[PDB]
């Protein structure tokens, strides 16, 4: 009767001004001693969703 | 573009200039098709009922247990495949109507009217009465003398003295007020009859 | 709108049985049993037209052999000779000649014998 949006998807993915979806990488909240600042630079940012699963995600958010 | 017919029990009256809405419109049959189909769809009542499992009495018993019977996996006596059973994916009472844009409806209607006008099928009248009382006989003679066709659509307005009375009992003749002017009727009827008052209100409404 | 699907069934049903006449037992009486047999019948016809072609070749060849051996020559040498002469004549009508006119057949044999080179050397 009326759609629902997967909440966790809405709380993890952000649609941009155009047809793209980004992921906040944050494998950096538990343990950070052995991880160098280099690896944290690699993880830091909001990368684009891989095209091997955008076709699923867009229906998860819509 | 600007033509009128004679008057019943009189001479001639009219001479009203018609705008482009009733003549210079290149009507699109896909549009007209969509609108008309929507109309016949909405006219359907949606009483197409049925009855299935859960509405049929009984059938909760599960006889003929699942081993040593030599029988099928029954499970219920009112299941589809058993006679006296329910219906699968049956005609549930759909209430439906193809809701469309006002622009599409209006364009289709003025398009069809412009086709009738281009083909010389407009009969603009001033009134239709032997003064006050109705006369099926008189209207029959007048309309049969003017249009010479079977199917006629009449537009009068809220005037029941003879406008909405003489036309009854006339196979193929329908009558309505402008505000209820659909397209199915117009496309069906050839010789479309309009009252002066009908054109005045209609044209004014459509500028 | 209940449609009562019988008519659509009856069309192909009777259409099949009237073509099924001639089979034995239930094969010419029951739809579901007749249908199966026609599947195999038509596959058989499908391959058997091709077989028919080949079998007729074999019968024609055999009869040619008989006439040739009555004329003291084998099929191998007969055909080789006809090729050397250039006699582009089929085996079908060659056999018909071999029956309705042995004399002309023998004449063709003499042509082939003349056309053969000499022996089994080259």
């Amino acid at each position: 009767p009326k759609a629902k949006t997967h909440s966790g998807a809405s709380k993890r993915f952000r649609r941009t001004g155009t047809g793209k979806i980004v992921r906040q990488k944050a494998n950096r909240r538990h343990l950070l001693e052995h991880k160098p600042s280099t690896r944290t630079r690699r993880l830091d940012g909001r990368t684009v969703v891989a095209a091997n699963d955008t076709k699923r995600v867009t229906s998860l958010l819509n | 573009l600007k033509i009128d017919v004679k008057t019943p029990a009189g001479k001639v009256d009219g001479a009203i200039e018609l705008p482009a809405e009733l003549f210079d419109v290149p009507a699109n049959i896909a549009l007209m098709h969509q609108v008309v189909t929507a109309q016949r769809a909405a006219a359907r009542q949606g009483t197409h009922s049925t009855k299935t499992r859960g509405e049929v009495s009984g059938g909760g018993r599960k006889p003929y247990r699942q081993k040593g019977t030599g029988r099928a996996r029954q499970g219920s006596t009112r299941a589809p495949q058993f006679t006296g059973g329910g219906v699968v994916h049956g005609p549930k009472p759909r209430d439906y109507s193809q809701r469309t844009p006002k622009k599409m409806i209006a364009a289709a209607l003025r398009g069809a009217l412009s086709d009738r006008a281009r083909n010389g099928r407009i009969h603009a009248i001033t009134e239709l009465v032997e003064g006050q009382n109705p006369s099926t006989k008189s209207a029959r003679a007048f309309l049969a003398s003017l249009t010479e066709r079977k199917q006629v659509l009449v537009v009068i307005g809220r005037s029941d003295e003879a406008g909405a009375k003489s036309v009854r009992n006339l196979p193929g003749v329908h009558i309505l007020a402008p505000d209820q002017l659909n397209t199915y009727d117009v496309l069906r009827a050839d010789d479309v009859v309009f009252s002066v008052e009908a054109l005045n209100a209609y044209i004014a409404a459509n500028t | 709108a209940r449609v009562k699907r019988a008519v659509n069934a009856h069309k192909k049903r009777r259409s099949i049985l009237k073509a099924s006449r001639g089979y034995r037992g239930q094969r010419s009486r029951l739809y579901r049993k007749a249908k199966e047999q026609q599947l195999h019948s038509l596959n058989y016809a499908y391959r058997d037209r091709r077989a028919r072609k080949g079998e007729f070749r074999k019968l024609w060849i055999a009869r040619i052999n008989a006439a040739a051996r009555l004329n003291d020559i084998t099929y191998n040498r007969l055909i080789q000779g006809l090729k050397a002469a250039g006699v582009e004549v089929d085996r079908k009508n060659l056999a018909d000649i071999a029956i309705s006119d042995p004399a002309a057949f023998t004449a063709l044999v003499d042509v082939a014998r003349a056309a053969l080179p000499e022996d089994v050397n080259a």
Binding site: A9, R12, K25, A26, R29, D53, L60 | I29, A30, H33 | -
Partner: protein, 142 residues
């Protein structure tokens, strides 16, 4: 008339009846397997064996304010082409043209060459908007 009336080519594609034989689609005609799919449509969320991508990934940082008084946008270039004559500008005129939503305050962009010398009745102009407005010779309100 109706006996001529027909539809446009390309619409009204035939409904695909599925379980109606082998010549059309098949005996299973779509659920062409024997696992779960032959009985049930599978949750798109559920992967099947591993931690879903939702749980796997981190929660997107940040929050949403309740008191986010969002303003609408009026592009000064759009003002240029909409009102080359100048004359008068205001909320009512912009919504009368339909370039901006109603019942809300509007900001002005620095996007576009403005030549029409006209005062603008609006709120929260950007610095570039004021520079363009006074370069043409108009004036901002508030």
């Amino acid at each position: 008339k109706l006996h001529d009336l027909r539809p446009a080519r390309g619409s009204k594609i035939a409904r695909t009846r599925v379980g109606r034989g082998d010549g059309s689609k098949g005996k299973t005609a779509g659920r062409g397997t024997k696992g779960t799919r032959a009985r049930k449509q599978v949750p798109v969320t559920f992967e099947g064996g591993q931690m879903p991508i939702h749980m796997r990934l981190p929660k997107l940082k940040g929050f949403r304010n309740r008191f986010r008084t969002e303003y609408e946008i009026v592009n000064v270039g759009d003002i240029n082409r909409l009102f080359p004559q100048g004359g008068a500008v205001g909320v009512d005129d912009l919504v009368a043209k339909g370039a901006v939503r109603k019942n809300a305050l509007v900001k002005v962009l620095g996007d576009g060459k403005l030549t029409a010398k006209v005062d603008v009745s609006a709120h929260k102009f950007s610095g570039s908007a004021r520079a363009k407005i006074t370069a043409a010779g108009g004036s901002a309100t508030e």
